[PDB]
Amino acid sequence: SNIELAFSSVEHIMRDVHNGYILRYLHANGASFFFMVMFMHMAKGLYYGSYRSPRVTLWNVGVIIFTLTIATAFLGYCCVYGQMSHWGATVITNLFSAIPFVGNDIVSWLWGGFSVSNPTIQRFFALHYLVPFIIAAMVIMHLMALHIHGSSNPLGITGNLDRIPMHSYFIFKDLVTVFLFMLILALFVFYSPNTLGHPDNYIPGNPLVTPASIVPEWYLLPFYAILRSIPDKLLGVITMFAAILVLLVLPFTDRSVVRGNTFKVLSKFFFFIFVFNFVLLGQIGACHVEVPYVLMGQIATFIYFAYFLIIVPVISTIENVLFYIGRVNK
Amino acid sequence: KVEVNLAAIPLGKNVVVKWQGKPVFIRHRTPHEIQEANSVDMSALKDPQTDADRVKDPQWLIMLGICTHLGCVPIGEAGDFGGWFCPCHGSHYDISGRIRKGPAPLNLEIPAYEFDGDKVIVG
Amino acid sequence: VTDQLEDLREHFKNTEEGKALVHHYEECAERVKIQQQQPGYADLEHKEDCVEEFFHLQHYLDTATAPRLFDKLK
Amino acid sequence: DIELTQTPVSLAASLGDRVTISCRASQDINNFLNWYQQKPDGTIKLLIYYTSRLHAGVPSRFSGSGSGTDYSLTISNLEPEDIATYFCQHHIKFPWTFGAGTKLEIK
Amino acid sequence: EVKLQESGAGLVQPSQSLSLTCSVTGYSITSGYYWNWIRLFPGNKLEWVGYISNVGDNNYNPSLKDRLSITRDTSKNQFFLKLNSVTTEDTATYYCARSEYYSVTGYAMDYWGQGTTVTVSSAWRHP
Amino acid sequence: MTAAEHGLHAPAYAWSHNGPFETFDHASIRRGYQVYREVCAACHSLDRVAWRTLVGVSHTNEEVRNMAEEFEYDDEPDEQGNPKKRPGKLSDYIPGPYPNEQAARAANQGALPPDLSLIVKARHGGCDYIFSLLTGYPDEPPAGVALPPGSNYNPYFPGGSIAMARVLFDDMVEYEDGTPATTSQMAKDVTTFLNW
Amino acid sequence: AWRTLVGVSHTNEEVRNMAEEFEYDDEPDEQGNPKKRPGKLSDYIPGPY
Ligand code: HEM
Ligand code: HEM
Ligand SMILES: C/C=C(C)/C=C/C=C/C(OC)[C@@H](C)[C@H](OC)[C@@H](C)CCc1oc2c(O)c(OC)cc(OC)c2c(=O)c1C
Ligand code: FES
């Protein structure tokens, strides 16, 4: 973890350790696959109203796991100590400098000195090792809340009238997607191991030079775009954090009287507006701070927040009323 | 405490040197740049400073090359204002290194320094 | 022998499309050297270059030479 | 109160050759000596500050040297719009004082 | 780019007050440096008259210090010379100019007005 | 962003190692080493490559041993504590031309030639980019382009202005296996070697 | 390290004089040739061999 040795020690894993490149490429590509699947797990929850009562606690613990997983991957990314590592560590620790009065004190405390240095990378490795185990404990708390109410289902109604045991049916159904998941992860690890990363992180970190080609990891791009859209330091970092916390608001702003979007024409449509808006945010994040892009990012940012705070409450109310007047004859 | 030999720097060139782990920007400015710097109205600056508030000798721009947004190192001779561009979130600095556009709230900081003939001593 | 890439480039500069592209680059190059010999060039902040027209040429040549060059190499 | 003595006073030269004006002050100014250029049209410009530093726009063929109490303003060629009256001020203390002036004529 | 434009009476009678206005565009008086008046006599001897700073601090040549008052108007972005009880002495072309100040190189007047020629004459004009 | 600032998109050459079932061409690797030794090594280090990794890839156990022994490395001090040197062994890493960064900048107009151990993975475009850069120096820059003193023009480099001159010219290398050492052939070979 | 002596057994000034009596390796000059340096307070007390 020494800042002099970290990059070379990873090259040593790549070159000298038997099957070392397999371990490293599994880890790096697996982190990406971990996010792909997490987004799908979350999107599933969004679509089927899984965040609703009585599964609010389940959802809230999920949001904590997501924050922890994002922090864990950032800590790991820094451990390579390539160019993207150094400046990622610099930019992200600096998020806290936006805190009124005691912000630069937090940052120098996080760094362990004047800038991102040896103290910084050694403590980020120690922390990267720790947080996966806290995530494991939070997953247990997640499964505990899952167990008392059980899973929901695609119809959004009670499952109590027809259950089948986990064993056999869903054990072997899980196996189908486990192998498909492994197949695809294998295609990347063996045939295309660097396609999801950044070439600049094969350059040792340099405290005097920030590459013009710096781009965040792909799974952080939508959030990056949101921050970049606000031309103010403090409000940029507040709005970006709020883009994660606003997930907590959905049990209250979903006014509907039925769980999930399966039988909801307007909600289905706007859900996919949300998804593709999120992809756009990420494509904006990958782009230069230039004319059409800056405005598109600011509008996509608005659409992102408006979904939770405005569209869902308005549309779910309208759908409530439409369901009623379409059947009642007085 | 770093010593930099100013006699070694050519006319319109940037030099980057390390001091306390941070990059220190030094430009030998051209006469035209010096005028460009001291002919800008404060109303156009979110962090209002004259070029003279920021340099002791108009020929030598000496500043910490740390972007005041989130700490990236701005790229020299780039941007829309004839100075430095920060690739991280698109902050533009002018030829005095003041913030002209983007999320950075402040001008590039000036460290303490004195001259000793042909060499400046930063620290 | 003569370089295999230089060969294929020269060959493709002399197709109809390649001739059209060097023409447009040449018409740019003419326009530029005329601008340099008219006073106040070192003080114009609006100097035209021909990188764009050059890139179109080079792009065409790349597109034609790239799929073929290695069948000629060992 | 310091006073400067611009010598030579109003000396002329030809259509493209060097020339050396000077400024001498009564008291010792550091190097705080500027040189101005008043055109025949009354248009007045800055040429040199701190007795060596070129201002924006003033061509390479202008120099400027000296220290203590003796100073200079040298040219390469006079081609052709170098014809004007050249002054010099100090600014080490108030009040600022200029030289007697030095016209440049062409024979 | 900065521009200094001068206006005012090109002819005053002795024992009266000379008033010249220097209009600045492209840069505020309150923003920056020092704002000077100087005069050129026909005998070709330039004299520094005085300044007002961006703060509003005055500083005059002791030769003329008891007569003149250099004012400004922030709203319209212009400073003024007012030379009281004029003599045939005060027959000169007057210039307003900006000077910078860097702590190493000192002062230097870098932006100049057009020059307004004033004559102290007993003649009648048409105001 | 302007095309010049982006740099010219490198095209896709038909590398024999492209494709899921394709190994490197090891003869091209062998040749590429020679081009590295005779041209590139004068300015470019290769710090992460140990001599032993060549064995069974591009050279024999014997050939690599001879190559390593041509270089001196620091050894353990003698019985009395005075420093002493040593011929290279297979456990050693391929040595670089310069002793430190400052000496490397001095020999290159102030520019720093990157180590090439990872250069194929540390650039967008990979082999296509490296090859295209090496074969893409025009005899003259496009009209209007004012190049800094000491700089060279290359359309594939971002910003066009690169501190490495063209260094590959026809038949500057005598290939040990008889192959015509054209510039595009030599480029093809080092690039294959650098990917390995 | 020299600095740990300060405020313990010696003054800031005394330790500085003591450290400067020794030469330590410095960063290479502009041209890459090695060069030495008087000791500073950040340095560790040097050994005989
Ligand atoms: C030998 C055929 C050779 C190769 C191969 C080669 C490659 C190479 C690359 C890929 C780069 C990086 C460019 C980039 O940043 O995208 C690079 C850079 C420099 N080189 Fe080189 N180089 C080869 C040969 C030589 C030789 C013999 C010299 C020294 C005379 C030389 C020098 C340099 C320098 C200097 C650079 C820096 C470029 C810059 O920063 O602008 N190379 N090279
Ligand atoms: C490491 C991370 C996580 C693990 C291991 C995990 C695991 C599980 C498991 C096993 C289930 C049951 C099967 C399923 O519905 O897929 C479940 C359900 C659920 N999880 Fe997660 N989860 C994780 C993260 C999250 C996150 C990030 C969220 C949301 C922010 C979340 C929200 C939910 C919800 C709401 C359900 C119930 C879905 C329903 O039944 O309709 N989970 N999770
Ligand atoms: C001890 C642990 C500490 C101090 C920190 C943990 C907590 C922080 C986070 O969330 C938990 C944080 C990762 C954040 O979450 C809001 C992410 C969305 C970060 C998004 C992010 O990424 C970047 C990145 O990756 C880069 O790489 C090259 C470069 C970057 O600039 C150009 C950024 C960047 O500008 C942003 C906003
Ligand atoms: S760090 Fe420079 S703009 Fe964000």
GROMACS .gro file of C-alpha atoms in nm, chain A residues 83-84 87-88 91 198 200 210-216 224 228 285, chain B residues 72 86-89:
model
   22
   83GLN     CA    1  -0.340   0.872  -1.265
   84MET     CA    2  -0.716   0.827  -1.228
   87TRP     CA    3  -0.704   1.259  -0.899
   88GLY     CA    4  -1.009   1.056  -0.805
   91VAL     CA    5  -1.142   1.533  -0.619
  198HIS     CA    6  -0.959   0.385  -1.821
  200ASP     CA    7  -0.487   0.656  -1.777
  210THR     CA    8  -0.389   1.611  -1.427
  211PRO     CA    9  -0.451   1.440  -1.764
  212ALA     CA   10  -0.686   1.619  -2.004
  213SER     CA   11  -0.847   1.279  -2.059
  214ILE     CA   12  -0.965   1.230  -1.699
  215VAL     CA   13  -1.309   1.066  -1.686
  216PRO     CA   14  -1.477   0.902  -1.382
  224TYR     CA   15  -2.078   1.326  -1.181
  228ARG     CA   16  -2.106   1.930  -1.300
  285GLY     CA   17  -2.082   1.278  -1.780
  402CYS     CA   18  -0.710   1.924  -0.993
  416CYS     CA   19  -0.918   2.271  -1.544
  417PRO     CA   20  -1.012   1.943  -1.718
  418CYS     CA   21  -1.194   1.807  -1.413
  419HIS     CA   22  -1.509   2.019  -1.418
   0.00000   0.00000   0.00000
